[PDB]
Design a binder for this molecule. Structure first.
Ligand SMILES: O=c1ccn([C@@H]2O[C@H](COP(=O)(O)OP(=O)(O)O)[C@@H](O)[C@H]2O)c(=O)[nH]1
Ligand SMILES: O=c1ccn([C@@H]2O[C@H](COP(=O)(O)OP(=O)(O)O)[C@@H](O)[C@H]2O)c(=O)[nH]1
Lengths: 341, 341
C-alpha cells in the first residue's frame, strides 16, 4: 500500500558474483513488490526487478572496465532519487553516509540501513546526522549508540535457491569464501587448514588496496593442491564450494557488520568455524551450526568436531532466523514507525 | 554588497605548499572581502581568511594521517553549505561535480568553477546538469560544448608576492615544479635536461597512485648529483627555484585545465618550455614568454634558444593577463549575470 524507493549501491548488479548489499536490496525489493507496494529501484541498468528500475548507467561499475570514477555515478543516483522526493512515502537508502545531507533537504522521510563498519572518520558525519532513521543489521554493529536506531533488522538470503548438500565432498576440503582482505583473515585460513591437515579451497575478489596483501601474503601459499584459489565465485560456484566443504573457515579480524557468507554456508548444510568478532556471535549458534573461536588453534580444534554437527539443522537454522519473509516484514514495520513520526 | 559563499576542496589549507585550487580560492576570497562583499569560506579549520570561516574538520586532509575518508568530510561540507543556502545571494563552488545534484534542491543560484579535466566518466554527470552555471578556467578545457558556460575566467596569482629575478643563476639549471605525476611529465623533464646537458632542479608532491610511477621512473634518476629534488616546496622555496632557472620545463601529457606553475615561473622572470597540450597555448606566448613544443626533442632544441627571451616581459605578461584584480572583477561580473537570470 505504500510508495517505496530502494537506493542500491551501483558497484554490483542488484548480483552475478560478489556483492552482499545488492543481494539484500534485491530480495527486499522483489518481496516488497509481491506484497503490493509501488517500488522504484535505483540501481545499475542491468539490474533485474519487477519494480520500476531507474538507472543512471547501463552496467554495474566494478566489473565494467570502461568506468572507474565511482563518485560520478553515486551523485547521479542521489540526484535522480532526491529530485523525486515527493514521488515516495518512504526512501530506503542502502548507500551509506553520502545520503545523509540530502535527507535534511527534502521532506520525504528516509531509512538508512547500515551496511558497513563505523570508523573514526564516518562517526563524525553519522554523529552530525544522529537523528535520522537508522537500521542496523546486527546489534554489535551499533558502536555509536548515540544514533536514532529504529530497529535491528538482520539480513536474509533466498534459502531455496541454495542446493542442500547432505554430506560433504570427498576428497575432503575446507572452504574460504570472501574478499581477500586482511579483515576476513584468509591468511588465518591457510594456517588453520595446514595445521589440521585438510586441503583448502579459497574463493573471492581481490581488489586494489588489498593487492599488496594478496601478492605478499596469500599468493606464495597457494601452490595448487593443498591450497587452491578458484578466484571469485558466482552463485552456483560458491554454493557448490560451500556445500561441498566440511566447514567454511571465517577467521575474521574486524568488527564484521553481518557476514552473509555464514548464512550461505549453513543453507548449503555446511557449518561455520568463525573467530568470535563482530556479528559472528549473533549469527553462529555455537555447538549447533558451527563454532565460535578466539584463536587459530581454537579453530583447528573446532574443525575436528564439525563432523558431529547436523548439516540439515544448519539449513533449518537459516530458514528460522535469516529468511527473506522475516526481513521484509521487519522492514515494513520500520517504514510504519518512520511514517507515523 | 553581496552575500557570497566560497566552497573550497578540503585537501589543502585555503595553501602551505602544494595546492592550486585552494590558492586561487584564497585569492578570490580575500579580495572579495576587501571589495566589501560578505563572504563565507567553507574550507578546513586551519584556513586563514578575513571572511567567515565555516570548517568541517580542523586540518587539511592530505597531510593529515588520522583521516582516510575524504568523502565523509566532503559530504559534511556540502551539507553545511546547502542547508544554509538562503544565507547567500550566490554560492561559488570549487569542489567539482558532487555539488551538481545539490544545486537542484535549493533555489539559491550556484556558480561552478571547473578546475579539472573532462573524462568519459564525468561527462555523464555534467551533461545531466548542462543548464547550470559553469565557469571554465581556459578555453581548451571546454570539451563538452553542450554546457551553460557563463564565462572563461583564467586563473591568477599574486604577482607582487613573487620576487623577480632579473638574471638566472650561474651555472644554469632547468626547473620542474609540480606534482610528480605522469600527467605533468617529470620523466620527460629529466630526459630533456640530460640531452640538453643543463642540470635539472625539481620539486613537488607524490600522492599515492603516482607512488609506483615515482619509484620506477623518477627515483632511479635522482640518486645522483646532477638531478636534485628537495620534495614539495613552499612559496619562498618554489619562487627561488623558478626564478633561478633559465627555464621551467612543462612537458605535460594531459589536457591540462590551466597550469598555475607556468604563470608562477613567468612572474619570477623565467620563461617556460611547454608541450602544447590543454591550456598551454593560451597561457604561453610562443617566442615571447616561452616556447610551445610537440615532443621531447622539440623541448631540447627550444631550451637552446631560451636566452633570447626577455625576462621582465615575462613578468609584465603575468601582470597584464593573470593578475588577481582581473580575475575577481571577472568573477563579480559572473555573479551579476547569474543573479540577473
Ligand atoms: O567470490 C565471492 C566472494 C564473495 N561473494 C559473495 O559476496 C557476499 C559477501 O558479503 P559478506 O556479507 O559475506 O561480507 P562483506 O564482503 O560484504 O564485508 C556474499 O554473498 C558472498 O557469497 C561471492 O559471490 N563471491
Ligand atoms: O612542491 C610544490 C609543488 C606545487 N606547488 C604549487 O601547487 C600549485 C599547482 O597548481 P598547477 O595548476 O600548476 O598543477 P595542478 O593543480 O593541475 O596540480 C602551484 O601553485 C604550485 O606552485 C607547490 O607549492 N609546491
Amino acid at each position: 500500500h505504500m510508495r517505496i524507493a530502494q537506493v542500491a549501491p551501483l558497484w554490483e548488479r542488484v548480483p552475478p558474483a560478489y556483492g552482499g548489499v545488492e543481494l539484500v536490496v534485491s530480495l527486499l525489493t522483489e518481496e516488497l513488490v509481491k506484497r503490493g507496494h509501488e517500488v522504484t529501484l535505483f540501481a545499475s541498468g542491468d539490474s533485474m526487478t519487477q519494480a520500476k528500475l531507474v538507472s543512471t548507467y547501463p552496467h554495474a561499475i566494478r566489473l565494467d572496465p570502461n568506468v572507474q570514477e565511482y563518485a560520478v555515478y553515486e551523485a547521479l543516483q542521489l540526484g535522480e532519487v532526491f529530485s523525486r522526493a515527493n514521488e515516495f512515502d518512504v526512501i530506503h537508502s542502502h548507500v551509506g553516509y553520502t545520503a545523509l545531507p540530502y535527507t535534511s533537504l527534502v521532506k520525504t522521510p528516509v531509512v538508512h540501513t547500515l551496511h558497513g563498519r563505523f570508523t573514526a572518520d564516518n562517526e563524525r558525519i553519522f554523529s552530525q546526522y544522529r537523528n535520522q532513521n537508522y537500521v542496523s543489521i546486527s546489534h554489535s554493529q551499533r558502536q555509536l549508540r548515540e544514533l536514532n536506531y529504529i530497529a535491528t533488522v538482520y539480513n536474509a538470503i533466498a534459502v531455496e535457491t541454495h542446493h542442500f548438500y547432505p554430506q560433504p565432498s570427498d576428497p575432503p576440503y575446507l572452504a574460504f569464501l570472501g574478499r581477500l582482505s586482511p579483515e576476513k583473515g584468509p591468511h588465518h585460513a591457510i594456517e588453520i587448514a595446514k595445521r589440521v591437515g585438510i586441503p583448502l579451497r579459497m574463493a573471492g575478489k581481490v581488489d586494489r588496496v588489498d593487492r599488496d596483501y594478496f601478492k605478499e601474503l596469500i599468493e606464495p601459499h597457494i601452490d595448487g593442491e593443498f591450497i587452491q584459489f578458484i578466484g571469485e565465485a558466482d552463485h552456483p560456484t560458491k554454493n557448490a564450494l560451500l556445500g561441498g566443504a566440511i566447514a567454511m573457515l571465517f577467521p575474521i579480524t574486524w568488527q564484521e557488520p553481518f557476514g552473509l557468507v555464514m548464512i550461505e554456508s549453513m543453507a548449503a548444510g555446511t557449518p561455520v568455524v568463525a573467530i568470535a568478532k563482530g556479528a559472528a556471535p549473533e549469527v553462529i549458534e555455537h555447538g549447533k551450526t558451527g563454532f565460535l573461536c578466539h584463536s587459530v588453534e581454537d579453530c583447528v580444534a573446532a574443525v575436528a568436531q564439525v563432523p558431529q554437527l547436523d548439516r540439515m539443522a544448519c539449513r533449518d537454522y537459516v530458514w528460522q532466523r535469516f529468511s527473506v519473509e522475516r526481513m521484509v516484514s521487519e522492514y515494513e514495520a520500520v517504514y510504519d514507525t518512520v511514517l507515523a513520526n
